[PDB]
Design a protein around this nucleic acid. Structure first.
Ligand SMILES: [Mg+2]
Ligand SMILES: [Zn+2]
Ligand SMILES: [Zn+2]
Ligand SMILES: [Zn+2]
Lengths: 196, 143, 563, 119, 99, 83, 97, 568
RNA sequence: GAGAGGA
DNA sequence: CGCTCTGCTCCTTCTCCTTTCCTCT
DNA sequence: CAGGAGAAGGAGCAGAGCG
């Protein structure tokens, strides 16, 4: 978790003029930055602080209060010096997707920088990895698994056409927008209890 | 909307937990608070809590993730105090870590030789003589 | 998931006029109109695949689809098409600009006709820190005169004369450009003149009957040669001609018709089918362009090809503007210019909603800053009042009343819903019970509401004033006669307009700036203009005449009469 | 008025090609001598892209890390100023941006006559 | 519409808008001549000031610079008629707020 | 460009009729959007009358940015302006 | 005020007001619009006619200024707040490792 | 049917609007220098003569340091031609132009290196051809070099001596010249400066007459103008003989660059040889080639004496230029030659024994006879000064060369009937359709078809003779002329745009597939393509390289086709 | 579309 | 010393405007 | 169908320089 520093413009409707101004500012910022991915920086958790608030301005047709504000948001962005635990939701023969307990389930780690003995198994989908004469070291679903993050992918493109939107709706894309690629080159991964 | 700084000063994974818990207390999102007034009885005072669904969900998920059982039934940071954090920073400043991996081992306190060796690059090559077991014995107690 | 979305309020900083460079015309387009026919003639008059009324260019009906935004007539902004011409033609709007560009350049090297020092000085004058339109136009005209003074190209070393309209006639002659190379060579030896003499000697040896026409017959600049010359004008010599070459489309060749932007069908709807003038004109343009293109490959007579080219040029000129030729199409120029054009009939002065117009009658008992309104029109002139926890009870009572009894309401718009819920039917009692704190009630006009009372012609500012509405049974806008001096009202059968502002801002500005009480003095001299009219001065004079002597009862009756 | 050399069959739709159909004869297969030039056209150009006079442009975290330490610098970037300059040619106002007082260093653009094209 | 057989409004022409200008009433002018007469929510591209449909520029084909704003439908009709000629009314936008 | 400090502000300390009408319109628009009022309501419902009553007691919480032609601007509080 | 006596005809106005839309609205619409397209004029919409045509707010009258609501927030809470982060950040670069 | 959403993408219509000069120059600078340099060159071409302040204002990348770095990058590579003018009213300002010769040098790099290697008889020895190729590559890529830096780069004494000898030989040959501030001053402004200091200095007494005063000023200015133009071409720096060992060595401190005029004269010689190869035998073509190589250094400049660009041509005295040129074209000592010199320098591999048949080696008589048959043709390949003495007339050979190239381009693109019609209209003058049919002997239907397809370019011009008060059709007549200047200019612009389009496509393809191109040099893995990359990457890289090779081959062909129109 | 009140 | 361009200045012949709209028919 | 006011080409002379 890392503090950011973002400057934005906040619309305060007259309904919220009675409460504290900072409370309304934080409410609107949360309405914009609660559990959403800020492009090129990751996912924002909660508006932490608030500093350098300029006097609000009114446009000639709405009657709200538009305030230019700066604040320090809470975002998650681990690059290299980290080890992250997670759970397992679904696995198939193209890698393993590691999930958390509600934060976000977008981390997918393939078997590129993983253990050499890992292999696929359509049945009892698992990550069998002998590494010795004993081959009973398969990865189980819904268990602690530690992994490193080697790189982060940002999907920040949208060249879609209205005709294409209508065609896809009649026929109904890369849903992820902030995913991290995992690595388990060193030991101690797979389960925090396997390595003592 | 322009991001003035893509990354400000780093935040330790102890201030975030207490900050979120205090935020839920102010907004009355505590499990005890919701079980007391909003559960097992009707709102006599009708003092409704904060009404942000997405914020409630994300803050509950992050506080639960920070308060899971420690990955070797609590995460240590749950019972960690500010003075315990001061003791921990003194102990870590007495040691040598190039990056701010000190905050990284604050994030997770595995208290294992293998995990501490893996968390920092070339732990054996950098220094592995007598202070590594001291690190493990002071990190076994989360305080 | 759910990446953030950020929006900011933005206003129109300012327009930047320019032309389209035959690459933005194609970029905007959805279909190339390449068929003279309009309807398929088989599937019950459906629009053709690439005709003028192609659906991809918009929808002219209320029960069709535009195939590009998939909306009805109300929700279709309209989409453009492109029509690629053959043998480009002059743009009638830029024809004088084309003349100036031709006068500013050679006809062999296609380079500007000013010396290096002269163009440096002129550019220095153009790039002064403060220059308006007038000084810039004067500088450009001086540049044009200076380059018209030139007799030889500085690079090609070719003779240059005068570039002028052919005959300034009605049709083709008004769009023909002739170059007179040999006007300024009086008696000096010019190699071009000798070449001309040799060429005409050759042709007269072959055909001697054209001797009488060797006079005149100047260098003719058809649109194709003009385009080929404009393609060679260096950008560094383009600022002196007035064209800013910094951005694309800032080229002299973008002012010659090579692609016609076919406007959306919304701009040129079909009435009851019966297509309007623009569709017919562009259909004719497509037909003539196809004829020219086919004749190019069929090897038609050069006379026929030139005649069809000229006919196409006249057709597109009429399309842009119907004043070009006499032999009543509503050209875009007709649609814009005029008293009823878009600028003077639709942009600077529109027809506004929530307005009425009725006869006027006097009403002395009505105080100034008030106007009496019929309840037959106070029940249609609704004001949108938003529930605000101060008038929730009043608004729900009005909803209960309904749209028939005057202190009621016509429409209810819920906070989240889009369509207005009419209060004419649907058990409005429960709707009043379910009146939230953000809904809008179109309440009937009532006492104390602000209205704009106006009488035409609006000679001065006091011809329109803001009054407080009152409700009276009759059918006439009744106003106190004292305020009839500003409007110049007559009560001889005069009529007046009454507008109802629909926002708190407009209403407050009307009642505080245009209020009758705040406009008792005319602005031209400051002398009062709202005061006693006829018969009020007579009553005052009869009361204050020295013969008047009142006892106590008569005095008290008078004092109860004035109050 | 349909012309003498045209009929109603050939007219009715205005189909302009919008695509060229008249090619120059310079599109034929390349020759060995022409294949050489190219290389001396790809090599030149490549050298000036690697050359100091480019200024073409119109991860990197501030956190110290032992991993980035003990790693060599990518190369010895040669800026525009470091190149030797004949001062009497350039305008005076550009002297403040060149290497008027800087260590001399010139890069030699070696030419490899062997083609770098695959196969 | 204009007549009385067609339920139409009263024309507030050039003289009336000049009278409104004389009072210096700006919000009332905006409400009368745009809000209560004809309001259209158009999508103008922030790069090339040409109106787009459904948040689609149709020229940049990016939908990133599209900005929604309300202008009179008469102005939109004028812009389309000018674009039908060889005139490009490229609207340049600036932030209303931010000082 | 910057705001002229309150200590010296050439603009008239009076309140022009245009500023008064705009303040009343803005306050009435805010009140019509369910905004709190700072005066004794006395049963009035139309937002314009509430705005007028608030301006009578100088209770309207708005300020005016008087934009000079150069670009600078003096911020005048409605309470400080005189009528 | 431009320097020379200028009438109130369509000729004297064309030498006073640069705004192409205003001149087109007054008189000689198509000629002015085509001239502004050719010379590539860059008018900034500030006149009342320009604002009315584009549905904006004028610069005269009530649109000659701005209305601003004071946030009225104290300086004793807007200051940055944190719980002793600089403790563990004792500048590890001070020591060798 | 192709929708416009696809036409805008795969029809090259967006770039079809760009001016060919601006398009070509910006594309070349972007490919060889970068994006900032491309933007600066684009502003220079679009506006012309911009100072640093105006360049900063007119570009979004308005960093003053960035603009100055771009300007020094363009000046060291002489892609710009600045000018330092002093304002009398106050502060002086320096204005920058766009240098066409430097951008052409960037354009002709491959051809320049090919000419350098081939013309010097050093490829045969196979040992210093690499050295001279590296020398010319460094000179053309770094802009301006002093010999001491190049020599100090190398260490071997033998290599140093070889490089110095090659420098001396190249400078003597004429491909390398001393670079001076004259190379960074516009010729038009140079003539403007030289017009004064010869007109102002005239005493305020009655000058002969104002027209005669200006004539005297022009006559005095042309002399020192030609002198200062030829000053870099005097070899005043190579003559540092005997510093030690008494050998001819170039002065170390003198900066040397490549002489574009010499290379373009070589290109003109090659074009003339190619033209002659279509009129005489292979042996006679070889004789003409060796004569051109002998007279190449002493030939007049390809473009002009540099006075045509400087000022207005004249009232009508522009012909004087021609005459003056013709005088030098006949009287430069190196130009005139006899068969003896050719026989002296003719290679022994040429048979030259049975080539010529008397009636239905290295013999002087046979070479003289071949020169006579060269001079006999209507094409002025050679002209006779004295009995048995020949000189190649460049003045009378440019128009015929341009006409032949243009006619053959028309013949290749359109049908041969197009060439027939163009030549018929050119030889005739103002010819109607009936006379066209009479003197061309083909179908009038195809005559009209070809005329319509040909008028699309500035090849055939329609002259309208009105037979009524109104000049409308169906009554007027339409004659046809040629106006070869329009045709030449339009075809030159067309070829420039085609070259710019090829370069734009090449850069686009390089950028699109840049990942594997970068990987090819990420770890110095060049030459190991098959043994390190995936087969799909192998195929993709092979296709990219072949496409770039074809692009540059077509660019070389376009250059060989447009040089003739570039001549004057 | 154009004939005419009307104020 | 007439001769021959420029340049200026008339002179003629051309183009764009003429409230408000407010109805009916 | 009248009235007003500009822009654009012929056309007739001064004026300058000249070989
Ligand atoms: Mg009356
Ligand atoms: Zn549509
Ligand atoms: Zn010319
Ligand atoms: Zn766009």
């Amino acid at each position: 978790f890392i503090l950011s520093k973002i400057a934005d413009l906040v619309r305060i409707p007259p309904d919220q003029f009675h409460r504290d101004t900072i409370s309304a500012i934080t409410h609107q910022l949360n309405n914009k930055f609660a559990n959403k991915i800020i492009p090129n920086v990751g996912l924002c958790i909660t508006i932490y602080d608030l500093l350098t608030v300029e006097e609000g301005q009114l446009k000639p047709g709405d009657g709200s209060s538009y305030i230019n504000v700066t604040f320090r948001a809470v975002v998650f962005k681990p690059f290299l010096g980290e080890i992250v635990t997670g759970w397992i939701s679904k696995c198939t023969a193209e890698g393993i997707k590691v999930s958390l307990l509600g934060i976000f389930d977008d981390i997918f780690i393939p078997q590129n920088m993983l253990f050499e003995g890992c292999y696929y198994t359509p049945e009892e989908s698992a990550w069998i990895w002998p590494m010795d004469e004993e081959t009973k070291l398969y990865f189980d679903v819904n268990e602690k698994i530690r992994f490193r993050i080697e790189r982060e992918v940002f999907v920040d493109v949208k060249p879609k056409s209205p005709k294409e939107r209508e065609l896809e709706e009649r026929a109904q894309e890369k849903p992820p927008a902030y995913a991290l690629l995992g690595s388990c080159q060193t030991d101690g991964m797979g389960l925090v209890s396997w390595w003592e | 909307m322009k991001v003035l700084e893509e990354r400000n000063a780093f935040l330790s994974d102890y201030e975030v937990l207490k900050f979120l818990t205090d935020l839920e207390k102010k907004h009355l999102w505590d499990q005890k608070s919701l079980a007391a007034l909003k559960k097992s009885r009707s709102k006599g005072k009708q003092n409704r809590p904060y009404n942000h669904p997405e914020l409630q969900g994300i803050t509950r998920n992050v506080v639960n993730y920070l308060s899971i059982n420690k990955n070797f039934e609590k995460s240590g940071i749950s019972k960690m105090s500010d003075e315990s954090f001061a003791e921990l920073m003194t102990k870590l400043n007495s040691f040598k870590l190039f990056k701010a991996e000190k905050l990284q081992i604050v994030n997770q306190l595995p208290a294992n030789m293998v995990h501490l060796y893996s968390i920092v690059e070339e732990c054996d090559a950098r220094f592995d003589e007598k202070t590594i077991e001291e690190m493990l014995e002071i990190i076994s107690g989360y305080a | 998931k759910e990446v953030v979305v950020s929006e900011t309020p933005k206003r129109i900083k300012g327009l930047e006029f320019s032309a389209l460079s035959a690459a933005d015309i194609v970029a905007q387009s959805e279909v190339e109109v390449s068929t003279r026919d309009l309807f398929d003639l088989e599937k019950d008059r459906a629009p053709k695949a690439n005709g003028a009324l192609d659906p991809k260019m918009g929808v002219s009906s209320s029960s069709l689809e535009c195939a590009t935004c998939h909306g009805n007539l109300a929700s279709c902004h309209g989409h453009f098409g492109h029509l690629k011409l053959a043998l480009p033609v002059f743009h009638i709007g830029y024809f004088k600009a084309t003349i100036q560009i031709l006068q500013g350049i050679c006809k062999n090297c296609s380079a500007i006709l000013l010396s290096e020092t002269d163009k440096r000085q002129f550019l220095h004058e153009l790039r002064r820190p403060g220059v308006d339109n007038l000084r810039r136009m004067g500088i450009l005209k001086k540049i044009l005169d200076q380059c018209k003074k030139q007799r030889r190209c500085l690079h090609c070393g070719a003779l240059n004369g005068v570039v002028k309209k052919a005959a300034a006639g009605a049709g083709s002659a008004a769009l023909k450009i002739i170059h007179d190379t040999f006007r300024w060579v009086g008696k000096k030896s010019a190699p071009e003149k000798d070449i001309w003499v040799g060429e005409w000697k050759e042709v007269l040896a072959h055909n001697p009957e054209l001797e009488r026409y060797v006079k005149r017959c100047m260098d003719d600049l058809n649109p194709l040669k003009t385009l080929n010359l404009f393609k060679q004008i260096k950008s560094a010599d383009c600022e002196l001609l007035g064209i800013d070459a910094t951005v694309p489309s800032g080229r002299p060749e973008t002012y010659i018709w090579r692609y016609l932007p076919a406007p959306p069908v919304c701009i040129r709807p079909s009435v009851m089918s019966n297509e309007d003038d623009l569709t017919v004109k562009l259909t004719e343009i497509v037909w003539t362009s196809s004829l020219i293109k086919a004749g190019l490959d069929k090897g038609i007579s050069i006379n026929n090809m030139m005649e069809h080219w000229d006919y196409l040029q006249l057709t597109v000129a009429m399309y842009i503007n119907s004043d070009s030729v006499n032999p009543p199409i509503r050209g875009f120029c007709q649609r814009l210019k005029g008293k009823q054009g878009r600028f003077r009939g639709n942009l600077s002065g529109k027809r506004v909603d929530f307005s009425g117009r009725t006869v006027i009658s006097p009403d002395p008992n009505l105080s100034i800053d008030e106007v009496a309104v019929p309840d037959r029109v106070a029940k249609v002139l609704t004001y949108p009042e938003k529930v605000t926890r101060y008038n929730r009870h009043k608004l729900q009572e009005l909803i209960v009343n309904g749209p028939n009894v005057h202190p009621g309401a016509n429409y209810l718009l819920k906070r989240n819903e889009d369509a207005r819920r009419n209060l004419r039917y649907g058990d409005r009692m429960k709707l009043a019970k379910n009146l939230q704190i953000g809904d809008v009630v179109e309440r009937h006009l009532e006492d104390g509401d602000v209205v704009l009372f106006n009488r035409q012609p609006s000679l001065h500012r006091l011809s329109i004033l803001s009054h407080y509405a009152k409700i009276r049974p009759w059918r006439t806008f009744r106003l106190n006669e004292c305020v009839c001096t500003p409007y110049n009202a007559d009560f001889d059968g005069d009529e007046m307009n009454l507008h109802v502002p629909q926002t708190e801002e407009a209403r407050a500005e009307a009642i505080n700036l245009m209020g009758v009480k705040n406009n008792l003095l005319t602005p031209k001299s400051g002398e009062p203009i709202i005061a006693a009219t006829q018969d009020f001065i007579t009553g005052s004079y009869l009361i204050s005449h020295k013969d008047s002597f009142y006892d106590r009862a008569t005095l008290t009756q008078l004092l109860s009469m004035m109050s | 008025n349909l012309p003498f050399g045209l009929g109603y069959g050939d007219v009715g739709k205005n189909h302009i090609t919008e695509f060229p159909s008249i090619p120059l004869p310079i599109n034929g297969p390349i020759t060995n001598k022409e294949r050489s030039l190219a290389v001396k056209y790809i090599n030149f150009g490549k050298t000036v892209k690697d050359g100091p006079f480019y200024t073409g442009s119109m991860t990197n975290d501030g956190i110290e890390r032992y991993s980035d330490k003990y790693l060599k610098k990518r190369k010895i970037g040669i800026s525009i100023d470091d190149h030797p300059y004949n001062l009497n040619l350039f305008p005076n106002e550009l002297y403040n941006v060149m290497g008027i007082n800087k260590k001399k260093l010139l890069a030699i653009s070696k030419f490899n006559n062997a083609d770098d094209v695959f196969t | 519409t204009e007549g009385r057989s067609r339920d139409g409004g009263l024309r507030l022409g050039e003289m009336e808008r000049d009278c409104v200008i004389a009072y210096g009433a700006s919000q009332l002018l905006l409400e009368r001549l745009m809000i209560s007469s004809d309001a259209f929510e158009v999508d103008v591209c922030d790069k090339c000031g040409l109106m787009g449909y459904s948040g689609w520029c149709t020229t940049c084909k990016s939908a990133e610079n599209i900005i929604k704003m309300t202008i009179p439908y008469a102005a939109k009709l004028l812009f389309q008629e000018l674009l039908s000629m060889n005139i490009a009314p490229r609207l340049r936008l600036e932030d209303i707020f931010q000082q | 460009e910057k705001a002229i400090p309150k200590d010296q502000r050439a603009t008239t300390p009076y309140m022009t009729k245009y500023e008064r009408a705009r303040i009343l319109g803005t306050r009435a628009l805010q009140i019509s959007m369910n905004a709190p009022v700072f005066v004794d309501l006395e049963g009035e419902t139309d937002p314009l009358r509430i705005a007028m009553k608030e301006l009578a007691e100088k209770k309207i919480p708005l300020v005016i940015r008087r934009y000079l032609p150069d670009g600078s601007f003096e911020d005048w509080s409605v309470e400080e302006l005189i009528v | 005020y431009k320097g020379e006596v200028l009438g109130i005809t369509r000729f004297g106005l064309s030498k006073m007001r640069d705004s192409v839309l205003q001149l087109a609205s007054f008189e000689k619409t198509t000629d002015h619009l085509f001239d502004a397209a050719f010379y590539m004029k860059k008018d900034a919409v500030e006149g009342v006619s320009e604002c009315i045509i584009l549905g904006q707010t004028m610069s005269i009258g009530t649109g000659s200024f701005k209305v601003v609501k004071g946030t009225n927030i104290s300086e004793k809470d807007l200051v940055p707040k944190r719980c002793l982060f600089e403790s563990l950040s004792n500048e590890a670069a001070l020591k060798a490792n | 049917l192709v929708t416009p959403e696809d036409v805008m993408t795969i029809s090259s219509l967006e770039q079809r609007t760009l001016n060919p000069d601006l398009f070509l120059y910006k594309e070349l600078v972007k490919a060889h220098l970068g994006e900032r340099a491309a933007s600066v060159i684009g502003m220079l071409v679009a506006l012309g003569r911009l100072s640093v302040r105006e360049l900063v204002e007119k570009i979004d990348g308005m960093d003053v340091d960035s603009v100055k770095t771009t300007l020094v990058s363009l000046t060291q590579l002489r892609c710009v031609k600045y000018l330092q003018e002093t304002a009398i009213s106050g502060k002086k300002t320096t204005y920058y132009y766009y240098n066409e010769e430097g951008i052409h040098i960037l354009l002709y790099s491959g051809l320049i290196i090919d000419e350098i290697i081939t013309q010097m008889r050093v490829n045969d020895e196979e040992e210093h051809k690499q050295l001279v190729a590296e020398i010319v590559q460094n000179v053309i890529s770094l802009g301006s070099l002093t010999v001491e830096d190049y020599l100090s780069s190398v260490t071997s004494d033998s290599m140093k001596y070889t490089i110095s000898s090659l420098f001396v030989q190249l400078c003597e040959m004429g491909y390398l010249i001393q670079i001076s501030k004259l190379h960074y001053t516009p010729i038009e402004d140079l003539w403007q400066f030289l017009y004064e200091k010869h007109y102002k200095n005239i005493p305020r007494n009655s000058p002969l007459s104002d027209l005669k005063k200006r004539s005297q000023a022009k006559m005095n200015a042309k002399t020192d103008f030609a002198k200062i133009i030829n000053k870099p071409n005097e070899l005043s720096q190579i003559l540092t003989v005997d510093p030690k060992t008494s050998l001819r060595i170039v002065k170390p401190t003198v900066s040397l660059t490549i002489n574009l005029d010499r290379f373009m004269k070589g290109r003109r010689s090659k074009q003339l040889i190619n033209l002659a190869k279509t009129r005489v035998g292979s042996v006679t073509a070889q004789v003409y080639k060796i004569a051109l190589r002998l007279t190449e250094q002493k030939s007049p400049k390809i473009r002009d004496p540099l006075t045509q660009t400087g000022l207005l041509q004249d009232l009508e005295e522009a012909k004087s230029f021609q005459d003056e040129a013709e005088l030098v074209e006949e009287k430069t000592p190196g130009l005139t030659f006899n068969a003896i010199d050719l026989a002296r320098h003719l290679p022994a591999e040429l048979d030259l024994r049975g080539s010529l048949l008397s009636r239905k080696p290295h013999s002087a008589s046979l070479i003289n006879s071949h020169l006579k048959i060269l001079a006999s043709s209507n094409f002025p390949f050679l002209n006779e000064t004295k009995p048995g003495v020949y000189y190649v007339p460049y003045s009378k050979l440019m128009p015929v060369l341009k006409s032949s190239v243009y006619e053959y381009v028309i013949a290749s693109t359109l049908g041969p009937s197009a060439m027939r019609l163009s030549r018929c209209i050119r030889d005739n003058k103002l010819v109607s359709e009936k006379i066209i049919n009479s003197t061309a002997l083909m179908k009038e239907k195809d005559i009209r078809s070809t005329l319509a397809s040909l008028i699309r370019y500035n090849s055939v011009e329609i002259q309208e003779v009105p037979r009524t008060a109104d000049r409308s059709a169906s009554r007027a007549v339409f004659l046809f002329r040629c106006k070869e200047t329009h045709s030449y200019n339009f075809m030159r612009q067309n070829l420039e745009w085609n070259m710019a389009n090829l370069l734009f496509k090449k850069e686009k393809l390089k950028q699109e597939n840049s990942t594997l191109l970068k990987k090819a040099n990420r770890d110095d893995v060049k030459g190991r393509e098959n043994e390190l990359l995936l087969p799909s990457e192998l195929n993709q890289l092979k296709m990219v390289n072949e496409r770039e090779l074809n692009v540059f081959a077509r660019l070389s062909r376009l250059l060989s086709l447009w040089e003739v129109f570039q001549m004057a």
